Enzyme design. Structure first.
Site, PDB file in Angstrom:
ATOM      1  N   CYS B 128       0.842  -1.185   0.000  1.00  0.00           N
ATOM      2  CA  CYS B 128       0.000   0.000   0.000  1.00  0.00           C
ATOM      3  C   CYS B 128       0.890   1.254   0.000  1.00  0.00           C
ATOM      4  O   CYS B 128       1.499   1.595   1.016  1.00  0.00           O
ATOM      5  CB  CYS B 128      -0.926   0.002   1.211  1.00  0.00           C
ATOM      6  SG  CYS B 128      -1.880   1.502   1.345  1.00  0.00           S
ATOM      7  N   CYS B 131      -0.001   4.086   2.726  1.00  0.00           N
ATOM      8  CA  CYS B 131       0.414   3.806   4.100  1.00  0.00           C
ATOM      9  C   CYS B 131       1.934   3.768   4.272  1.00  0.00           C
ATOM     10  O   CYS B 131       2.464   4.263   5.263  1.00  0.00           O
ATOM     11  CB  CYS B 131      -0.222   2.505   4.592  1.00  0.00           C
ATOM     12  SG  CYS B 131      -2.009   2.652   4.703  1.00  0.00           S
TER      13      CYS B 131
END
Lengths: 172, 173, 168
Positions: B128, B131
């Site tokens: 991700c 993140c």
């Protein structure tokens, strides 16, 4: 309940979130449980698929259930193919997939629902091409973003649940 | 990790060598290192790898540490899907309230630094970007060196290679 | 196969057809095809698919080739996380040396063409653009036509669908 009960203490937000998503009033009982079931399959966690699947029977027809599971399977293939094609900056876009995906056109249940489940799975697998394509389709068939967003939330919550559950079982 | 290394097949020597090296490396705390090998082990979903590392992490990690590490894997499990997905959707959902509880992030039960390091490690495993970047920025803000962060990324990747390697032998034997 | 093809559920009918055809396809030679299916099966982490594909692959893969395929999945399991990760950090960590052993890449014990094809297939499954691109390039460098590469991508995707279908 029993699934929530199996979640560790260092996974309290997940349990909390699982309770809130299960009591969702934004998505149909079919939209909701079909999403939870397709998501559960997409996590590859047996226990999570078993417990969600057991509870799902009292909320989904055999047809709905099968459609949810088949969305997971077909996105398992599409999510890898299209993402890869996208990473190749379109240089193979002219080739011709040659892959069957009839379930998509003929799901056996409302297409708005199949799309919702396919979108949820694409979120779990991480294919922007498919997540975007399906999101566009949902909008074209009358699903509002509140509902599309609820599906994204559910797919994420269920992934957390599977991660939390996988750790407890391997450690305990 | 002694049994894990032994479990690896000759065609996976590089991973064995990397596992041996990352464990003996000293760029990270005893807590940072084992807490990262643990959150990573958890994030790979390989039972055997989590079981072996989890056991060897007890005599290397406090109770609160072992808790924050496993909790980072779990919460990133959800966040890594949610933010990544919203990030793909052309800004169309940036104004909606996520309504997702993630209090553990603000209260890991240990100073934030290590939690953020393990969250960063997990975000790498799940893939991700939102993140990874967020947590990398937070790590820096609270004084964590790039070398430490980079070492976590490496540890995350090596554990992932170990899980793959072992997953295949378990399944084929 | 056969037992594998047969295990697929009915609501996964399309994947059954895709498996039946990708395995009957000639685009790739038997080693290319079965080494890609084996490497992919490993990357899906589904134990049943890996077992069935691994067993069927004995008739078309030498010992060196089978280990190269399994070894490709392992090393990509690490590289796919590392390079993707560094890639998202906006080049801010590009000045540091990885220091990760990867000797199997340069020395797979078989022709690189095949090792690279299998590593490409795994990178597609794990989702690392940096590696999928780097291997697609090498593949073209030493030959290999887009059709072969495209067939591997298809195979990697089809194998991912099989694993999921079975997991359901």
């Amino acid at each position: 309940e029993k699934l929530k009960a199996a979640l560790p203490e260092y996974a309290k937000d997940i349990k909390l979130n699982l309770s809130s998503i299960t009591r969702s009033s934004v998505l149909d009982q079919e939209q909701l449980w079909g999403t939870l079931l397709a998501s559960a399959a997409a996590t590859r966690n047996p226990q999570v698929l078993a417990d969600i699947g057991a509870e799902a029977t009292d909320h989904l027809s055999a047809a709905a259930r099968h459609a949810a599971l088949g969305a997971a399977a077909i996105m398992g293939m599409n999510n890898v193919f299209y993402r890869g094609r996208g990473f190749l900056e379109g240089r193979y876009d002219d080739l011709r997939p040659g892959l069957r995906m009839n379930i998509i056109a003929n799901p056996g249940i409302p297409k708005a629902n199949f799309e919702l489940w396919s979108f949820a799975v694409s979120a779990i697998n991480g294919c922007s091409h498919c997540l975007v394509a399906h999101e566009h389709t949902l909008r074209t068939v009358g699903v509002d973003r509140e509902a599309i967003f609820e599906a994204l939330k559910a797919a994420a919550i269920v992934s957390g649940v599977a991660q939390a559950l996988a750790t407890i079982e391997a450690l305990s």
